[PDB]
Amino acid sequence: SPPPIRMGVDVPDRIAGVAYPQGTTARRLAQIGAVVTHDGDTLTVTPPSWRPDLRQPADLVEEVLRLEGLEVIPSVLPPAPAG
Amino acid sequence: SPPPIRMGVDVPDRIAGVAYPQGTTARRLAQIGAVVTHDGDTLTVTPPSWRPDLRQPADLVEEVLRLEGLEVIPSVLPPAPAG
Ligand SMILES: [Mg+2]
Ligand SMILES: [Mg+2]
Ligand SMILES: [Mg+2]
């Protein structure tokens, strides 16, 4: 197994701009074959041996979002500073 | 005397973008000749008879800001929406 990954439980929610139902991240990361232990607000994710691409939290964020579906992500125009 | 005017004590601070020291609004408004009474966060200002121009909270804000000096107002570039 690759080394374990530490990630805040709401990190996929922040990247997506979507409040996912409770347990969505741990469930999705379990589906792809990773062992997920819950420690307060920090998940400890150990990806399976067939997923060496999962090395950082951003890698784990992609697994959650792509299984929940990118269509749920809303469209929010950012304000850029005065150029 | 004109009718009295109700205004939040920090309304001049909000318009100016400056946190004035405690009691600045009440003191400045007394100087110009108005009777000021407190009630929590609301001031009741009765302008003097020689100031029929003082009719709305914005009129009182001008008195506070111009006596404190407009030079203390900082420069904050507002973010406009995507045009
Ligand atoms: Mg990836
Ligand atoms: Mg990568
Ligand atoms: Mg005026």
Closest residue, chain B, to A77 (C-alpha): B82
For residue B66, is it within any domain?
yes
Q: How far apart are CA B41 and CA B56, in angstroms?
A: 17
Question: How was it solved?
Answer: X-ray
Domain hosting residue B46, numbered range: 5-72
For residue B25, is it within any domain?
yes
For residue B77, is it within any domain?
no
**Helix (H), strand (E) at residue B21:** none
Number of domains in chain B: 1
For residue B9, is it within any domain?
yes
The Å distance, Cα B38 to ligand 2 centre, comes to 61
For residue B63, is it within any domain?
yes
Cβ(B45)–Cβ(B60) below 8 Å: yes
Cβ(A12)–Cβ(A61) below 8 Å: yes
For residue A78, is it within any domain?
no
DSSP string of A54-65, one letter each residue: --SHHHHHHHHH
Place of tokens 């784990």: A60
Q: Of A52, A80, A50, nearest to B81 (Cα)?
A: A80
* Resolution at which this structure was determined, Å: 2.4
Would you state the structure tokens that stand for residue A80, as one six-digit string? 């850029």
Closest CA–CA distance from residue A58 to any residue of chain B (Å): 28
The Å distance, Cα A14 to ligand 2 centre, comes to 18
Q: What is the CATH number of the domain that holds B28?
A: 3.30.56.10
- DSSP β-ladder status, A35-39 and B5-8: unpaired
Does A81 contact B at CB distance below 8 Å? Answer: yes
For residue A51, is it within any domain?
yes
For residue B79, is it within any domain?
no
Q: Which long-range contacts (CB under 8 A, 24 or more apart) does B23-30 make?
A: B24/B64, B24/B68, B25/B60, B25/B64, B28/B63, B28/B64, B28/B67, B28/B68, B29/B60, B29/B63, B29/B64
Angle at A57 between CA A54 and CA A61, to 5 degrees: 85
DSSP string of B35-58, one letter each residue: EEEEETTEEEEE--TT-TT--SHH
Residues of B in contact with A77 (CB under 8 A): 81-82
Question: Which of the 8 DSSP states describes residue A83?
Answer: -
Q: Which residues contact A48 (CB under 8 A, 6 or more apart)?
A: A1, A32, A33, A34
